[PDB]
Amino acid sequence: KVFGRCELAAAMKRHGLDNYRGYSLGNWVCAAKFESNFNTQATNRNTDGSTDYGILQINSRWWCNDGRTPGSRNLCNIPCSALLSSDITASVNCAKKIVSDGNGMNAWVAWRNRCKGTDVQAWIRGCRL
Ligand SMILES: [Cl-]
Ligand SMILES: [Cl-]
Ligand code: NA
């Protein structure tokens, strides 16, 4: 599923990401834009052989199982394919564990490089929330 901007904002808010660990909703929308272009089916292979999955490009080295990332963990206790669902529940629940792990949203490379420190409120401007 390719979400619209305000449609994703609403879904993330319902699932409890607005201000989760102090990260306002626009941070999460911005991260999703630059990680996946709002496409739940996005996948991207990394040099190390791990893969990033879904709307927030959650990586198989630590967070999910894809059966093809040797030595990896599955800290969210989910198949990586669950992160590709049109329902963002699994991705949100896993993102909550990631962002709680010490480094906050810096875990998301595109967030750090493209969202952090910017006017992220722009991402939710005009949305009915
Ligand atoms: Cl594996
Ligand atoms: Cl933080
Ligand atoms: Na894994």
UniProtKB/Swiss-Prot annotation:
C-type lysozyme domain: residues covered: 1-129
Binding site for substrate: 101
Assembly description: Monomer.
Keyword set includes Transcription: no
Lineage: Eukaryota, Metazoa, Chordata, Craniata, Vertebrata
Domain of life: Eukaryota
Keyword line: Allergen, Antimicrobial, Bacteriolytic enzyme, Disulfide bond, Glycosidase, Hydrolase, Secreted, Signal
Any Gene Ontology biological process: defense response to bacterium
Molecular function GO labels: beta-N-acetylglucosaminidase activity; identical protein binding; lysozyme activity
Compartments (UniProt record): Secreted
Task of the protein: Lysozymes have primarily a bacteriolytic function; those in tissues and body fluids are associated with the monocyte-macrophage system and enhance the activity of immunoagents. Has bacteriolytic activity against M.luteus.
Record-listed E.C. numbers: 3.2.1.17
Annotated S-S bridges: 6-127, 30-115, 64-80, 76-94
Protein name: Lysozyme C
Catalytic residue positions: 35, 52
One GO CC annotation: endoplasmic reticulum
Class in the EC hierarchy, top level: hydrolase
Homology family: Belongs to the glycosyl hydrolase 22 family.
Note: Lysozyme C is capable of both hydrolysis and transglycosylation; it also shows a slight esterase activity. It acts rapidly on both peptide-substituted and unsubstituted peptidoglycan, and slowly on chitin oligosaccharides.
Gene designation: LYZ
Tissue-by-tissue expression: In the egg white and polymorphonuclear leukocytes.
Organism per entry: Gallus gallus
